[PDB]
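Subject: sequence -> structure tokens, single chain

Hey, anyone have a minute? Need the predicted structure for the following. Not urgent.
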Amino acid sequence: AREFSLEKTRNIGIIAHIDAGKTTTTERILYYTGRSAATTAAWEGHRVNIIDTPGHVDFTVEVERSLRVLDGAVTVLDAQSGVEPQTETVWRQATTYGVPRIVFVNKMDKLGANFEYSVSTLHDRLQANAAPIQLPIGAEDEFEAIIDLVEMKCFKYTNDLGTEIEEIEIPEDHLDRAEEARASLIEAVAETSDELMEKYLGDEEISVSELKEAIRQATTNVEFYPVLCGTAFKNKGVQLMLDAVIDYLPSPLDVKPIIGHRASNPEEEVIAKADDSAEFAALAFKVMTDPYVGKLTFFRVYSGTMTSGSYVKNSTKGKRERVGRLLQMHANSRQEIDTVYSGDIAAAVGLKDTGTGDTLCGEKNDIILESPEPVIHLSVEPKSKADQDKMTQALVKLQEEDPTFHAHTDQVIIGGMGELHLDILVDRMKKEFNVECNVGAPMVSYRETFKSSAQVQGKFSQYGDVHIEFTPNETGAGFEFENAIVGGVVPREYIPSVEAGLKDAMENGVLAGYPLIDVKAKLYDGSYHDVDSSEMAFKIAASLALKEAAKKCDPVILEPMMKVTIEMPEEYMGDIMGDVTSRRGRVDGMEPRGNAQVVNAYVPLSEMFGYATSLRSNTQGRGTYTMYFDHYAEVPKSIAEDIIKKNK
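Reply:
Had a minute. Here:
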């Protein structure tokens, strides 16, 4: 059957800033657990799956995803700096998905290392409930040992290899501060469940299992975050925190099961519990490719079971898949396996059509567990047709691992979330696939829509005729086409062509050439010739109606409005807001963080070029910012004409 019980499995990932020593902590974790998208491992009789989190936290989808693939997380902080801005955003993202966490204050041996101040930022910055289960005797060069408070055993470090560790009775001059630490811990834990709190005040002593299982409960409910310390590089406290992973972090059973919906019925509520007996459901979080095994699909099975050679349906794409070789990547090796039980993770070899973010389930069922318009695009220009073939190839591959962009072939136009998102896809193509090309200008993706509503008539003479009503739709509701035809004034044969006509005509727009969006269309009238009428004729007709509606509907150009967030020492708080308004944004709100303030704004993306330099300059590097797409907004009438002219 199965090697590890559902109770014995730990799916984890690492939340960290990039100076927090994230890669080293992961490195070390892999060592001790091993006798990369996802790594299979073992610690103290327990299965451990370490899922790799995204490179930069601006990566929302990529991080949103992994956050779903794991259960609990380990947050790594730099001892000097405690919680960084980047730590907070993912710490927030994690809370929204209800992910239990434990904190590893790393680099205790570093100049400026402060365990007390670190722990502080968890409180002050996140208003989060966290208390140390350990204490770092010594700091900076002096970091020596660690006191385990849930036990009250003290472990000492002789070397930097994480060996020859000495278990000792707590050095006594460290007591007055040790029981305090243990005490506050009990309290800080008490505020979650009621029972314990009363147990504590009763001057009653608490043993291990009751305290541990308590912390296990509080942290599993995401109501408390256990705090640990060490330096991963010298291997101080790494093994201890691994033990901690096994104690206080959740199994697949100990976390709220993922929500899903049926394909047939879009809006349903399907809970996927973790059950070996129940129906099969899986999500593909990563697509690798190896020169040998081919296309590897990384997926996490939430429910049921899967065996190689069996049959699954990809519900997202609605197609049929047949599971071949099944691999599990360990640190120094990889293992063929015939079964992946609920809660486990593996890679699927040669899975024909599945990308990142699809869903796999029994070919009898419909479930789907994951339900993003490009705001910016580039023009790409190869240096040959030979160089081209290396492209349409590269792209098909690039859409499998990156669902989040949009590639139009028809000089081929990439589009995506942000410049960075595009630069990466430029990166890999030039080097990874060896495509020698010309990258054009990064350009905002403008849209067009209708202000006024109107009734107009397309007509063409081969003959076609149409009367259409256009009304602006609820922004975001997209395009609707209703057919009101009255009894054959327009023959049914041509009615779908009228629709295909609008689309074509709408994609090319009216004003600047940008696609028209969020518009309702009702075909209520027309006329035809039994002979001359044709599909083409009614397509041109609908196209001409649009050109007309464009005259009476007061069309406007829309541009992406980004939600900008800025964190800087307050010194500059005035000189940033002079910036924003010049960029035609507006400050939507503000919050304190220490001597820095978090500023929330809405800025047009067309005006966000070069904001990186400016923020760094004005704050002299102390600055940080994230920005997202929020909504589309009406462009100022003067600017619209500039674009209208400039397009000729």
